[PDB]
Amino acid sequence: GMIRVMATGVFDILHLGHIHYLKESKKLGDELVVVVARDSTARNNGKIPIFDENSRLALISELKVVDRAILGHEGDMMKTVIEVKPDIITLGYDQKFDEAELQSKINKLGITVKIVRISKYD
Amino acid sequence: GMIRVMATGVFDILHLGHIHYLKESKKLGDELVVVVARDSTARNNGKIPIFDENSRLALISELKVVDRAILGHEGDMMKTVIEVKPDIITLGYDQKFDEAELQSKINKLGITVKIVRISKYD
Numbered sequence A, B: 001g002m003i004r005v006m007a008t009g010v011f012d013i014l015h016l017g018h019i020h021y022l023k024e025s026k027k028l029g030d031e032l033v034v035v036v037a038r039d040s041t042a043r044n045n046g047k048i049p050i051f052d053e054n055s056r057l058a059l060i061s062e063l064k065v066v067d068r069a070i071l072g073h074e075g076d077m078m079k080t081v082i083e084v085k086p087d088i089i090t091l092g093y094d095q096k097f098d099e100a101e102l103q104s105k106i107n108k109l110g111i112t113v114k115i116v117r118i119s120k121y122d
């Protein structure tokens, strides 16, 4: 009985652009669940985080706007969305997903979710 | 009685050391006020921060455990203490020298303010 919003990212060096992404995400519902990329997932995207996955998760968990934070699953965003059951998934201004592709992918799993692109912080 | 705790720092790049300092400081009272160093002060103490003072302050304000955050005074700590009027001032575990120095200031003036060193972070 609440609108659950899922946001994602690496969150290596926290900065106000993150805060903008997370607050705009929280506004859309009641609960904000943040999925923090695994170090392996981050490397496979050509980033080696300065802070390890456990440290990045713990810091994100300390933010007022974050209700729950969990680690992602290496290789398997399908499973995260199945386990979180968001009503809404938010995409950062620069995140590399096509809203259409993501939607059809999620619909093939028999899940209905609203996908929203968040603005760049200025 | 609502105990006011004052913590201080630059908080340039947030990390779990900062979180342990802030979180343990909050545990000691009811309101945590964080005093964030101005860019001139940090520079003058030989630590150039990469994030500007307004950014650092704004990010610190987003932490669950922080009730209020303010910019410090350009080179005059006792002026901050006189304005914030904390019940407790929190220092890092390593800072016994700063502790003794602050204690002499307190004692000469005869104000009621308790200094507490926070436990060493792991």
Ligand SMILES: Nc1ncnc2c1ncn2[C@@H]1O[C@H](COP(=O)(O)O)[C@@H](O)[C@H]1O
Residues within 6 Å of the ligand: A008, A009, A010, A011, A012, A016, A017, A018, A020, A021, A091, A092, A093, A094, A095, A119, A120, A121, A122
């Ligand atoms: N400057 C910014 N403006 C808006 N959103 C941002 C900014 N910086 C990071 N984000 C978002 O925060 C999430 C995590 O970014 P990252 O830690 O770079 O993976 C992604 O959705 C980003 O688009």
